[PDB]
Amino acid sequence: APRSVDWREKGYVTPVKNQGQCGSCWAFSATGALEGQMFRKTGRLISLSEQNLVDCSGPQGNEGCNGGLMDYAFQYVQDNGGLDSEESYPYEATEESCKYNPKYSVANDTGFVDIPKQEKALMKAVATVGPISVAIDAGHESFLFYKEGIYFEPDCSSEDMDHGVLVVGYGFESTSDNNKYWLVKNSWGEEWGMGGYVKMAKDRRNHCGIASAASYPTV
Numbered sequence: 597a598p599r600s601v602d603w604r605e606k607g608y609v610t611p612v613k614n615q616g617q618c619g620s621c622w623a624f625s626a627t628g629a630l631e632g633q634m635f636r637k638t639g640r641l642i643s644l645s646e647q648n649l650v651d652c653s654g655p656q657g658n659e660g661c662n663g664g665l666m667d668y669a670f671q672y673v674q675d676n677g678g679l680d681s682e683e684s685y686p687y688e689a690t691e692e693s694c695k696y697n698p699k700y701s702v703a704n705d706t707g708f709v710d711i712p713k714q715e716k717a718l719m720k721a722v723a724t725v726g727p728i729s730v731a732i733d734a735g736h737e738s739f740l741f742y743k744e745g746i747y748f749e750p751d752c753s754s755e756d757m758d759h760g761v762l763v764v765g766y767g768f769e770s771t772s773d774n775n776k777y778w779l780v781k782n783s784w785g786e787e788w789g790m791g792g793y794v795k796m797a798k799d800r801r802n803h804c805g806i807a808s809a810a811s812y813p814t815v
């Protein structure tokens with residue numbers, strides 16, 4: 597794998613969004629992964645509808661603003677035959693009746709791939725596939741108030757993940773001792789972290805479970 601990857605540079609990543617006071621992180625993780633894979637396929641970056649996923653993916657197992665799984669989102673897109681654009685089906689931050697309209701479908705998927713539960717496997721995926729949906733343990737105040745640098749939380753769990761985000765690359769700081777990170781896009785607005793991103797500790801015993809439930813859609 598390259599020593600550093602940043603898919604933002606290659607046009608795969610939309611601007612940071614804000615989930616608000618709805619438990620829809622999983623939807624933003626899923627749209628981010630599918631935005632990447634559609635861009636790879638078509639050369640067009642089109643922002644996708646989280647609201648469509650929040651409102652419509654109950655049959656696949658998702659719980660709207662009460663949580664969900666990226667893999668269930670990818671299954672919904674496959675079962676449904678499409679996913680609307682953000683423009684056509686804007687984000688409300690509340691669960692509402694399903695208003696999917698196939699006329700405005702701009703994405704598809706044919707399934708998904710679960711990555712092996714090792715950081716080395718995650719690195720190989722990020723290097724070759726594009727942005728990857730991941731689960732992290734985000735349940736420490738250190739994460740809520742994260743501002744800059746490499747996030748390391750001694751009490752982070754590699755098993756107890758509660759937040760779905762998007763790995764858009766990886767690299768290393770030149771400053772001193774433990775300087776490698778995953779470049780992670782959050783869905784908490786641009787105000788949080790580093791423009792809405794968190795450079796998370798990489799190759800430090802699967803810190804915060806970042807490699808424990810990683811996946812991406814096939815297109």
Ligand SMILES: *C(=N)C1(NC(=O)[C@@H]2C[C@@H](S(=O)(=O)c3ccccc3Cl)CN2C(=O)C2(c3ccc(I)cc3)CC2)CC1
Binds near residue numbers: 619663732758
């Ligand atoms: C996002 N605003 C919130 N978190 C969730 O919905 C997270 C997302 C995923 S995950 O990324 O944490 C995860 C965890 C374990 C295995 C795979 C994945 Cl993708 C699930 N979320 C959860 O909080 C839990 C969950 C699991 C399944 C369902 I349906 C609903 C919720 C509790 C694991 C809402 C805060």
